[PDB]
Amino acid sequence: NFCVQIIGGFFTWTPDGIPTLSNITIRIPRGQLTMIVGQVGCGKSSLLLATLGEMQKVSGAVFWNSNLSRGPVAYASQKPWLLNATVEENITFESPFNKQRYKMVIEACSLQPDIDILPHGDQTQIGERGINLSGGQRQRISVARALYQQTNVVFLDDPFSALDVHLSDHLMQAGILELLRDDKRTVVLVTHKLQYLPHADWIIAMKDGTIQREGTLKDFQRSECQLFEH
């Protein structure tokens, strides 16, 4: 059925009661790039965790089915999770190594300057107990790790918010759209970047722990407020 379909959506973090969000009703079928947008702190992370299944639902199970009966779904959430090992092994993350695929990802991630600058290249101990890098560079490695996995569903949180460099984001944005189009996979991104906020693909708005709709960009015109005129 729908890759991201929610019936009740009464997820909560407290084991007993106190629902932090409820009345969630979305249905995202396969091959539907549905980025998630909203205001600051409007339960975007909680909704993303509830979608993965890390939050205790109250109303009931949102139901799931095999993309092409489920539960293994790619997800990254907030903050960079870095493996304290070599950068190259961090990128692969228990995945087969293809030179063309690795070069394609590093081109989209624009990690060539990062590897060249480091004296040991991508063999440096990235993360704790090693070489300390920039926060934006940590996010670029983190987001590229999920993308390189080549899965049918990809969940991302603040890909461009951590680093708003036009050169890095645009190539990553171009790489993300092209890779998703070729693979016909599902992509969900939570970010505050207005560079690609409107798109022909589906968009879902999250506010006050609920989602108004997850549909075409024409709903923004249908909505009373057109994102405050961008």
User: DSSP characters for the chain?
Assistant: --SEEES---EESSSSS--SS----EEE-SS---EEEESTTSSHHHHHHHHHT-SEESS------------------SS----SEEHHHHHHSSS---HHHHHHHHHHHT-HHHHHHSTTGGGSEESTTSB---HHHHHHHHHHHHHHT--SEEEEE-TTTS---HHHHHHHHHHHHHHHHHHT-EEEEE----SSSS-SS-EEEEETTEEEEEE-THHHHHSSSSTTT-
Length of the chain equals 230
User: Do 159 and 152 touch, CB atoms closer than 8 A?
Assistant: no
Q: Which token pair is 110?
A: 């624009």
Q: What are phi and psi of 157, to 5 degrees?
A: -135, 120
Name 223's Cβ contacts closer than 8 Å, sequence gap at least 6: 212
Among candidate residues 199, 202, 87, the one with its CA nearest the CA of residue 133: 87
| Resolution (Å) of this entry | 3.3
Answer yes or no: are the C-beta atoms of 175 and 108 closer than 8 Å. Answer: yes
